[PDB]
Design a protein around this ligand. Structure first.
Ligand SMILES: [Cl-]
Length: 1025
């Protein structure tokens, strides 16, 4: 049952954007005509005649399904399979069960798309706000009902005399190829529309010297790659001379065949739609790039090396690009499972929003057991540097260093306090993770799916059981390709090589994920780590990222780094730094459907890995977790839909301004690709100094790195550390190693920690509603200037997710930047210093300030009027990890100056992930707050949408711009009472000694503080007079 559909696989090698050219028409089929093929449920079939564009007398027929996926959220889908019957994927972001759930709900509400074939055979249907017509040759126009504006239309190509063929549906004649493509008209050059294309995951694009956000006029590809520095040499265009810089034609780590098109921006006729080509073979997105003749300025397309064809058009309910993101997340949602919390993604433990330090190149837990070696460092020293210097510090990313000889799921003695491996729970021999718990820390650790194979006769149970149970990918192909063999065997296994450089390497087997049993086996391995104290998972090398290899060479031998190239191409010999693509893997798209060459599904491997970790590792083995029952995954690879397994970090970046610019753009783009919990190594991962690789990141670049990342969702300083036994990397990078900048560095981490609830509540808004945490500037509506600012201005936080504006400096040795403030609102300069002083005067939205001053010690961060933000403080005033906060560490609702006499706020509350009762049983709370000024009376109202988690400590209201009141009354189901002036005359004293029902006039910061008892949190009317 290998190759059950009888495909002839014509192409195995990577094919750059330079070699993908559907608009050349040659050997491509396109839709030429059709007849109606019936409608069942919300799915119409059209029986489409595909004609060869270059010889239209050559013709073949395939059924094409047109399916309304949501009436209310204005989305539909087009799918066909030129290779066999249309088939529902059993694994992936979009599942039939969820589509069914959506349709069932909408039907029960009376939604009627009115899907009909006209007498002429044209298909027409409506969604809430749209109407669609599809003509005989599949020509499609999507019209918005309110104004009659056509907001999307696909493309037609002419032929000499055989009629117009619609390139909206294309595939290569199977005599020649396997590729597919779909082409729209692209209005980027239209003077009024000025369409811009956004999204596409982690792709980097340079314009002049600057990395930018928008992805218009460019040819992109998804081909998950071990792309260290984002510019791997083997990924260069044909005959490329000189340095290869990160740029748009280079694949990254996450597969995101996803674009959001935004036209008429900032105007009342703005429109936005998403375009998802749901394909896990190498895919392409060309937004009008003429380079290599890959595209045409006025056309846009998506395509892929292999079928099937399955495409979603997602317009969203409300107006604005954000609404496209929320609608896309619904299609991928888990409502069909009746998730009480995790509808659009999975909630992390609170601790995931802490500051972590990772080091590649530690050599022990304790100094007392650190082996001598140039620049060697113990985990203990790192923890001391942060804690002794009073940094808010969450814990560690422990790398492959801790393993016994790169055996995943193991540790070695040096990473235990008594210098020997225990089974856990021994107070006189604690593992790195147990010891870390005692420091108030939590840890992630590096897990890949390389199971070391060259063990020189030493027992390695994980590899042994994989062999015995035959769960490893075999060495079979349809091409008779010899993938190589070692003395270790087995004789039928696919054997690869892991290479961390500097001699840190090993042979490996890999799990054949598509097999039944593999996922359960994998997940069970995590018990070996959870039972010794591991908190969460750091998933690496997920392509799987194998050492480059050429067929015929030894498994441990890599090719010359210049190979392959245009003059000496791969010709089916290169592995493209993963599985040689000929390898037969058990199908990961369709269960119990046989094996297919990996080329058909490269981009689903990392996704399937994370899925197995999540379900069979983290969830099924939750009982074996120690301190926190909720866990999480931070992954390096994945595919649309990864957000239900965990978050991401953008792989191996480096230490320059350009990587800061990239980190910001990556974060915004990933967020709009429905992966919200993402970040990039703070300070940069690899060496940057070409003359001496060991030179650390400068103090100024570090300050800017930290400032730019301090409110981004995943915040970890991690780097490659030069040590004697791994002689590549930088000397150090830890924030405490920068004495001159230490105070600034510390205060930005403190600032993040104070806004821990702003982040956590935004994550809740993602899990519940699919709202991206980080907003692209163009998500701010009715503003014709945000587009210009979108490279480095972003928003987050508050009730609506647009209460905070960030515009970090993205250049070293720079103390000014061009600032744009979104229009139709007021802004307040904020940041680390403003907790302890008054706000400055309001800044008018719409203002553009050239050379806006930004000292090194500052970053441009602004709170919008009408924000009430939940803010946290430690009771004793010392910095501690998030995971060791209790409800006795004050929760404070900070009321910023009112917008139109009003302010609003929201706070999600649960036990931080100590248990999984929030997501399993609905044990969480959602508190809302409002402030209203009505003459001489301010009313501050607390209500709840649910209150299943009881906050155990007093909470506060801090009103900015208020001082001494005549009276404050508090009404609440618990008690109705007047407040009294506190005898405490400072904040520490109000916190520690102040009585419930005290107010404190804070002159230093022009704030009024109300101390209230916990019982009044879910419901209260506070009237200040
Ligand atoms: Cl990866």
């Amino acid at each position: 049952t290998d190759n059950p559909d009888g495909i002839d696989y014509k192409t195995y090698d990577y094919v750059g954007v330079w070699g993908f050219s559907p608009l050349s028409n040659t050997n491509w089929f396109a839709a030429g005509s059709s007849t109606p093929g019936g409608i069942t449920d919300w799915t119409a079939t059209m029986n489409v005649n595909f004609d060869r564009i270059d010889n239209p007398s050559i013709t073949v027929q395939h059924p094409v399904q047109v399916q309304v996926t949501s009436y209310n959220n204005n989305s539909y889908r087009v799918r066909f399979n030129p290779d066999g019957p249309i088939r529902d994927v059993t694994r992936g972001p979009i599942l039939k069960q969820q589509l069914d759930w959506i349709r069932t709900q909408e039907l029960s509400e009376g939604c009627d798309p009115g899907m009909t074939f006209t007498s002429e055979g044209f298909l027409t249907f409506e969604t809430k706000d749209l109407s669609v017509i599809i003509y005989g040759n599949f020509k499609t126009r999507v019209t918005r009902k309110s104004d009659g504006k056509v907001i999307m239309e696909n493309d037609e190509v002419g032929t000499a005399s055989s009629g117009n063929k619609c390139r909206g549906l294309m595939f290569v004649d199977r005599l020649y190829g396997n590729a597919i493509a779909s082409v729209n008209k692209n209005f980027r050059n239209d003077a009024v529309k000025q369409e811009g294309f956004y999204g596409a995951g982690e792709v980097n694009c340079k314009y002049q010297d600057t990395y930018i956000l928008e992805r218009t006029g460019i040819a992109m590809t998804n081909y998950n790659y071990d792309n260290l520095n984002y510019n791997q040499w083997d990924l260069r265009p044909p005959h490329h001379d000189g340095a290869l810089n990160p740029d748009y034609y280079i694949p990254m780590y996450y597969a995101a065949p996803w674009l959001i098109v935004n036209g008429c921006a900032g105007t009342s006729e703005q429109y936005s739609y998403g375009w998802f080509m749901d394909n896990v073979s190498q895919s392409y997105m060309n937004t009008g790039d003429t380079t290599w003749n890959s595209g045409q300025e006025d056309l846009a397309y998506m395509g892929a090396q292999y079928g099937p064809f399955d495409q979603h058009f997602v317009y969203g309910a409300g107006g604005g690009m954000e609404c496209v993101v929320t609608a896309f997340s619904l299609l991928q949602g888990k409502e069909f499972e009746n998730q009480v919390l995790n509808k659009r993604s999975v909630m992390p433990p609170k601790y995931v929003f802490g500051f972590f330090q990772g080091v590649f190149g530690t050599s022990s837990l304790l100094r007392a057991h650190m082996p001598a070696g140039e620049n060697n460092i113990s985990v203990e020293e790192i923890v001391e540097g942060y804690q002794n210097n009073n940094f808010p510090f969450e814990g560690l990313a422990v790398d492959v260093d801790m393993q016994d000889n790169l055996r995943v799921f193991t540790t070695k003695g040096e990473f235990w306090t008594a210098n020997r491996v225990g089974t856990g729970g021994d107070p006189n021999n604690r593992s790195v993770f147990e010891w870390a718990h005692d420091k108030g820390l939590v840890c992630q650790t590096n897990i890949t799916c390389f199971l070391r194979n060259d063990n020189e006769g030493q027992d390695y149970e994980v590899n042994q059981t994989l062999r015995e149970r035959q769960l490893y990918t075999k060495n079979d192909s349809l091409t008779g390709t010899d993938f190589g063999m070692t003395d270790d065997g087995p004789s039928d296994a696919y054997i690869g090589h892991l290479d961390y450089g500097g001699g840190v390497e090993c042979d490996a087997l890999f799990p054949d994920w598509g097999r039944p049993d593999v996922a359960e086996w994998w997940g069970n391995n995590y018990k070996k780590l959870f039972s010794i104290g591991l908190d969460f998972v750091w998933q690496d090398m997920t392509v799987p990222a194998m050492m480059p290899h050429k067929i015929g060479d030894d498994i441990n031998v890599k090719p010359d780094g210049n190979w392959p190239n245009a003059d000496d191409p791969s010709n089916g010999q290169y592995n493209w730094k993963t599985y040689h693509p000929q390898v037969l893997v058990t199908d990961m798209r369709y269960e119990n459907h046989g094996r297919e060459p990996m080329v058909t599904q490269r981009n689903i491997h990392a996704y399937t890995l994370c899925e197995s970790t999540r379900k069979e590792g983290i969830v099924e083995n939750a009982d074996t977790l120690t301190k926190f029952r909720r866990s999480y995954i931070i992954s390096r690879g994945g595919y649309i839909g990864n957000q239900h397994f965990g978050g991401m970090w953008v792989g191996d970046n480096s230490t320059t301004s350009n990587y800061i610019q990239m980190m910001i753009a990556n974060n915004i783009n990933m967020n709009m690709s429905c992966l919200p919990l993402v970040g990039s190594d703070i300070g940069g991962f690899t060496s940057y100094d070409n003359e001496n690789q060991r030179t650390p990141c400068t103090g100024d670049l570090m300050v800017r790195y930290v400032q730019a990342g301090c409110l981004l969702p995943w915040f970890r300083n991690h780097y490659d550390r030069w040590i004697e036994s791994k002689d590549h990397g930088k000397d150090y990078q830890e924030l405490y190693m920068y004495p001159n900048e230490m105070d600034t560095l510390r205060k930005f981490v403190e600032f993040r920690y104070r806004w821990q609830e702003v982040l956590y509540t935004a994550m809740y808004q993602n899990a519940a509603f699919g709202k991206p945490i980080i907003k692209a500037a163009s998500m701010y509506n009715n503003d014709s200037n945000v587009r210009r600012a979108q490279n480095d201005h972003f928003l987050l936080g508050g009730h609506d997710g647009y209460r905070i504006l960030c515009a970090p400096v993205v250049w070293e040795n720079s103390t000014e930047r061009e600032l744009y403030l979104p229009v139709l609102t007021q802004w307040y300069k904020f940041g680390p210093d403003f907790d302890t002083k008054p706000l400055e005067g309001a800044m008018n939205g719409g203002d553009r300030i050239y050379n806006y001053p930004v000292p090194q010690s500052e970053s441009p961060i602004f709170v919008r009027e009408g924000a009430i933000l939940p803010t946290r403080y430690t009771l004793n005033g010392e910095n501690k990890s998030l995971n060791t906060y209790t409800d006795e560490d004050p929760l404070v609702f900070e009321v910023f100056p009112l917008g139109n006499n009003r302010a609003d706020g929201m706070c999600y509350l649960d036990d931080g992930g100590v248990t999984t009762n929030a997501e399993d049983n609905g044990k969480f709370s959602v508190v809302k707050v409002a402030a209203e000024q009505d003459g001489g009376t301010e009313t501050i109202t607390f209500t709840n949408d649910c209150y299943e988690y009881v906050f155990g400590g007093p909470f506060y209201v801090r009103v900015r711009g208020a001082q001494s009141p005549s009276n404050i009354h508090v009404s609440s189901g618990a008690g109705s009472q007047d407040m009294k002036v506190s005898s405490a005359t400072s904040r520490a004293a109000l916190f520690n000694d102040g009585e419930n029902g005290d107010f404190w006039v804070d002159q230093e910061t022009d704030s009024l503080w109300l101390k209230l008892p916990n019982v009044v949190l879910p419901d209260a009317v506070i009237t200040i007079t």
